[PDB]
Amino acid sequence: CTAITLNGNSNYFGRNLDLDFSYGEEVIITPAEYEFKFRKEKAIKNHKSLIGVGIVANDYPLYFDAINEDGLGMAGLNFPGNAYYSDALENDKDNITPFEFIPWILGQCSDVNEARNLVEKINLINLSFSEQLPLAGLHWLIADREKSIVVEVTKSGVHIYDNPIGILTNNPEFNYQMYNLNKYRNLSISTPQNTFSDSVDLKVDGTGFGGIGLPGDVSPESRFVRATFSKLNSSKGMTVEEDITQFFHILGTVEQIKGVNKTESGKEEYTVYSNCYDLDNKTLYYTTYENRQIVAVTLNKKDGNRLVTYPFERKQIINKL
Template identity: 45%
Template structure:
């Protein structure tokens, strides 16, 4: 389970929580412009836009969970079990791309979300893993830049593309349901509520925050979508980079999972293994992990981007605490 959001302040920020029961070997990975991407059904991509994101590295191949390229285009894959449909054969007029290849295939060649939307509309997410030991994960994708965002869902019948005016994506059900479901919460407000229960009664609020009574508090994907949308769309941010990054993580904190609060059918405990925030203009990737709440940053443009070798940054997972005495 995961939550992906965008947030516009002076710059545009993208990021997500990744909720799992365990680590998947993730680390921050920078792919420079001349790293050679190989694809199962498409021509190699030897020269492309550089990118930074969280990935596990298999056989020197970055399997990105999310990333931003040097042009400020963001793409994240989120769990979509039961709905994701990967055809096992080619489709007429479509481009075969295996799902784990989609993020580098799109970010390597597209500058804008508009370009990515056009390409993804012609993609056939073919159900062939890139290796036998790497089974396909059921995914849908959140794609965004400074001008807006959209969702790509591989459903039965083909890839569906939806404009995303909310700038939020979680998991099941489909994105259409999440948008419709927001209508149930149109009465919520960050302001003091008015008495609409009965005008003949003298009803008044007895504490702050009562305009938000009814905002979901559980960790289901439908509730996280509503909660993230409410906090993001009502967000008031201070000036400067630090204020924007801090505000972004506060929004993600509202939908993060505490160990023990979500137990899977197999008896395992879901946690927010990491949360990230990426400045699309500067290419700085900020993250914190479940074990370490201090923010760590890695800068895309602090590296030599014309090389051909991956640059990997293992996560700082031990809690860092600053003492003042």
């Protein structure tokens, strides 16, 4: 998985979901008066409305990622083995399951400071949604129109990082990803001067030589470096449309095509879908592996207590002339 923010004409948050299979993902709107039940905390009958991508099970929205009516976003990304969910409750903490964590923050917080304040009081508990849907190790990107934080809950506790670049992938831990960038300082968007030696006339027979050393593989570290280089150098858009266009191109640079990454099951890991939330206009834009055409759904914060779902089109929608 790769999650990014982008600051342009509007402000953006979105992700690639990289898995061996789809899980029946769909757009889920959770309205202000859908009652959020928690395993070890008091129900919330009144909260911020959410739009996100996930699955519904037992009438519960299980989000991969979502935003709320205030343009606060959150995404869960794979964090295998490093994630630690506590088998003990905590007296003066909010005891919340991984699968409740997005509803817990996005339901109640308007921005990243409020989100940080609530995470500081959290105890993530090792309770599965069900026997059929056991817990996976995750970390989180929480983003508003201004800034983002990374939440990693490991054996050493609840770790909250200011994300200075608005980039997250998978393992290793965030300080390791940020440190790993340092060895790529010499990369450039333009042709380098010959610093190798002026005793040999080295020639340039094409463009893009300043990039030489950027990794091209789909390991999480390589995707972290590549997404950061692509995002931080990406040209500004004149319009929101150009920003959304640029957002999909950036996610495109770290996309996993079917065949290059074969899991232990023999199944290829691929980018199941890509999305771009316009935080200011509370609009979800998404593409899927099977369909290039961008789909848009807007969150109207109106009321209701029923989850509203829109299934994914998993056919290539071609303009035939």
